[PDB]
C-alpha cells in the first residue's frame, strides 16, 4: 500500500552492442523484482553526462534522434515481470529542439538546465509532439515531469513571456514588477501556475493516446516546500503541486542542497514536519532520497538509515535516485528491509 519508488536511468543499461545491452536490461529487471517495491520512475531520455540538455531519447519520435529503442521493452518487462508500475520520466523544457524556438531569457538588467520557453506556442506544440510520440510507442502507467520545470526571479524575460504577463495584467517591465513586493509575489505565482498548466497540457496529450488512467507526478525542489517564499525564484508551489498531480515527488536530498554532513538527518526530519503540517500532503507526496553524492555513492548503511528515519517520522511514501543496478549499489541486502512492501496486504 505505501509507495516505494526506484528512480532509474536507462543510461546505465546502454551499450552499442545490443547483446550486452539486453544482458544489462535482464539484470535491471531481476533487480527491481528482487526489491519488491511498487513503482519505477523510468528515464525516457538520454543524458549520460548530465549536461542539462536533451538531444536524444529512448523511443521512436518525430523530432529527435533515438539513441536506442529501449524504453518500450524495458517498461513492458518491468510491468509484467518485476511487479511495478512505470512512470515515464520526461524533461519539460530542456530539449535541444529547433534553434528558432524561444529559449527562456534572463532579465537583461538582472544581477548575476538549458530551457525552452513555455510561453512560446511552438515550444508547447513541439514538446507536445515528443510526449505524443512516447505515448504512441510504449505502455506505461504515469508521467513524471522533470525538475527542469522551474523559473528564477529573473526569468522568463523573453518576448512571448512578456506578452503573457501583460495579458495576465502585469507591467511589461520585469524590473518594475520586481520593484514592488506585491506585484513580485503575484508574478511568481503566475509563473508557477504557467509551468503547472503546461505540464497539464502535456498530460492531456498523453491521455488522448494512452487513455484517462494515466497518473501524474512531478519533481519539486525542497526549498519551495520548506521555505515557501522561495517560490519567487523557483516558480514551484507545493500546494499547487498537491492539487494538480497524483504525486508530488520531493527531492529530499540534503547533500545535493549542500547541507552539512552531520545535519542531514535533522534536515530530513524538518522536511517531514513541514509536510505533516498540511493535511494529507504526505499521502500525495513521495520523498525521493539521494543514493549518490554529486560523484560518490551514499553508503547503503546511510541510505537505509534515512529510510528508517522517514518511517519513524510517519512518512511511508518514499524512494531513491539513482540505482546503480549493475553493481548492487545500494546493497539490496541492506536497503530491502527498510524499503520492501512485500509484507503489506
Curated annotation (Swiss-Prot):
How does the protein associate with the membrane?
Lipid-anchor
Report the subcellular localization: Cell outer membrane
What are the record keywords, sorted? Cell outer membrane, Hydrolase, Lipoprotein, Membrane, Palmitate, Signal
Instruction: Give a GO molecular function annotation for the protein.
Output: hydrolase activity, hydrolyzing O-glycosyl compounds
Superkingdom: Bacteria
Q: In its keyword annotation, does this UniProt entry include Lipoprotein?
A: yes
Phenotype upon knockout is: Deletion of pgaB does not prevent PGA synthesis but does block its export and biofilm formation. The synthesized PGA is retained in the periplasm and accumulates at the cell poles.
- What EC number(s) does the entry state? 3.5.1.-
- A Gene Ontology BP annotation from the UniProt entry: carbohydrate metabolic process
Q: Name one GO cellular component term.
A: cell outer membrane
Q: Does the keyword Methyltransferase apply?
A: no
General function of this protein: Catalyzes the N-deacetylation of poly-beta-1,6-N-acetyl-D-glucosamine (PGA), a biofilm adhesin polysaccharide. N-deacetylation promotes PGA export through the PgaA porin.
- Give the domain note: Contains a N-terminal polysaccharide deacetylase domain, and a C-terminal domain required for PGA N-deacetylation that may be involved in binding to unmodified poly-beta-1,6-GlcNAc and thereby assists catalysis by the deacetylase domain.
**Similarity comment:** Belongs to the polysaccharide deacetylase family.
Q: What is this protein's record name? A: Poly-beta-1,6-N-acetyl-D-glucosamine N-deacetylase
Tell me the organism: Escherichia coli (strain K12)
User: What's the source species' lineage?
Assistant: Bacteria, Pseudomonadati, Pseudomonadota, Gammaproteobacteria, Enterobacterales
Point out the gene that encodes the protein. pgaB
Note the residue range shown relative to the complete protein: 312 to 669 of 672
